[PDB]
Amino acid sequence: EDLRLHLLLNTSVTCNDGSPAGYYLKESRGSRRWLLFLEGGWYCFNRENCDSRYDTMRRLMSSRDWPRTRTGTGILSSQPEENPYWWNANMVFIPYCSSDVWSGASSKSEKNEYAFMGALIIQEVVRELLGRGLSGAKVLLLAGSAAGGTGVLLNVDRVAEQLEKLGYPAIQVRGLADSGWFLDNKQYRHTDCVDTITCAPTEAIRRGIRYWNGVVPERCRRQFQEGEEWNCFFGYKVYPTLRSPVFVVQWLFDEAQLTVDNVHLPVQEGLRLYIQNLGRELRHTLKDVPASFAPACLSHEIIIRSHWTDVQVKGTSLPRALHCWDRSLHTPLKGCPVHLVDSCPWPHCNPSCPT
Ligand SMILES: O=C(O)CCC(=O)N1CCc2ccccc21
Ligand SMILES: *[C@@H]1O[C@H](CO)[C@@H](O)[C@H](O)[C@H]1NC(C)=O
């Protein structure tokens, strides 16, 4: 119970219901490395589905019931046994309470039942942490899992631009996007967008952006232009526009991807080919991503799981690959790879996949 809650001092930066957003912090005195982790957990995109989320997923929409501490797990653990990579870093967990894939910039008001302030929550956390030691940082790693991994892709360059404009050009901003690299592919079975369950991600994100006043990275926005900013929520389209170094972690057969593809798991030929094609398409999108870790498993999320050290690609674990990435950011390194993408074509053809 080692990260302590701080509600934002700027109480106009809020969770969906107007309660203050916040962050959990465990400082490491004398470390100059800061890890800011974005939680995930889907999204909502209209009044009716946000109301239902408010009933049964309220911690993702409000801080009113948040506990005063959380235990750091995985990459947020302070024990080297659990976190070989960054156990001595300053650790920040930012709860996801904006339901907008960390993209929103709209307040609750007479016109809006809910606030969607994900993009502003990240900016405000950064600004308040500067006074608590982040001003001395050498590396700020913005990490995130699930929708928080997409949030890294949408926000890492804005954090860099914010620190530059605040006069901290020496802080190196980097991103670690876990399980947020999705494909706008054909669904295995097809449903027109007539309610929440039938609405595919491209259409739900298109509606979400309008409902949230969602914002995307400027270079990506300039490519796709107005009405088409939903494209920037898809990693393979937004990543080439980014300037900050980003390490991408993605299971090849991601469970949330399969869910949005209407796949629910004795597999017959059509579904077999669908699954194999998904893994091939994911692998293809990572071909030119130099820092990546993509095991052939059916799962979702990795970096805050306590057993995150167990999975390996080509005999290299994720904490090792991240360490090699750090070294690369000081020509490739002998025996210390950073591009690790499985080539085998079926879930759990990698023996180290989670059980
Ligand atoms: O991982 C999560 O928390 C749930 C799934 C999620 O968030 N999805 C899946 C499809 C998609 C496209 C763009 C942005 C986000 C998402
Ligand atoms: C509070 O946050 C809002 C929204 O991001 C911002 O416009 C405003 O400048 C902030 N105020 C202070 C005092 O930080």
User: How is 177-204 classified by DSSP, letter by letter?
Assistant: EES--------SS---SSSTTT--HHHH
How far apart CA 252 and CA 234 sit, in angstroms, is 15
Asked whether 10 lines ligand 2 (CB < 6 A), one says yes
> How many CB atoms within 10 Å of residue 280?
13
Q: What is the DSSP string of 12-35?
A: TSB-TTSSB-EEEEE--TT--EEE
C-beta of 101 in contact with ligand 1 (< 6 A): yes
Chain CA centroid to CA 337, Å: 22
- Per the structure block, which two tokens stand in for 132? 């608590």
Domain that holds residue 111: 1-355
Residue 123 CA: which ligand 2 atom is closest?
5
Q: What gap in Å lies between CA 146 and CA 350, rounded to an integer?
A: 21
CA of 182 to the centre of ligand 1 (A): 7
Secondary structure E strands in the chain: 3-7, 22-26, 33-38, 69-70, 90-94, 139-145, 172-178, 246-249, 253-254, 292-294, 298-299, 312-313, 316-317, 339-341
Is the CB of 319 inside a 6 Å radius of any atom of ligand 1?
no
For residues 83 and 21, the answer to whether their CB atoms sit within 8 Å is: no
Q: Identify the three-state secondary structure at position 332.
A: coil
Other beta carbons within 10 Å of 323 = 17
How was this structure determined? It was done by X-ray
**Cα-to-centroid distance, 67 and ligand 1 (Å):** 26
Place of tokens 């904006």: 98
Retrieve residue 172's tokens. Answer: 């190196």
CB 216 near ligand 1, within 6 Å = no
Residue 181's CB is within 10 A of a number of other CB atoms, namely 26
42 Cα–ligand 1 center, Å: 6
Q: Which ligand is nearest to the CA of 200?
A: 1
Residue 55: count of CB within 10 angstroms of its CB: 8
Report resolution in angstroms: 1.4
Atom 14 of ligand 2, nearest CA residue: 10
How many CB atoms neighbour CB 310 within 10 A? 14
Using a 6 Å cutoff on CB, does residue 152 contact ligand 1? no
| Interaxial angle between packed helices 118-130 and 147-165, expressed in degrees from 0 to 180 and rounded to the nearest 10 | 50
Give the number of the ligand closest to the Cα of residue 179: 1
Instruction: Give the Cα separation of 109 and 208 in Å (integer).
Output: 17
Rg (CA), the chain: 19
Distance from the alpha carbon of residue 74 to the mean position of ligand 1, in angstroms: 21
Taking CA atoms only, the protein residue closest to ligand 2 atom 10 is: 10
Task: Give the number of the atom of ligand 2 that is nearest the alpha carbon of residue 120.
Answer: 5
Give me ligand 2 centre to Cα 122, in Å: 12
120 lines ligand 2 (CB under 6 A): yes
C-alpha 160: how far from chain center: 17
Q: Whose CA is nearest to atom 7 of ligand 2?
A: 12
Asked whether 158 and 119 are in contact (CB, 8 A), the reply is yes
Edge-to-edge strands, sheet with 22-26: 69-70, 3-7, 22-26, 90-94, 33-38, 139-145, 172-178, 246-249, 292-294, 339-341
Pairing of strands 339-341, 292-294: parallel
Q: How many angstroms does the Cα of residue 245 sit away from the middle of ligand 2?
A: 28
4-27: string of b/e by CB count within 10 Å (b at 16+)?
Answer: ebbebeeeebbbbbbbbbbbbbbb
> How many domains is the chain built from?
1
- Count of residues in the chain: 355
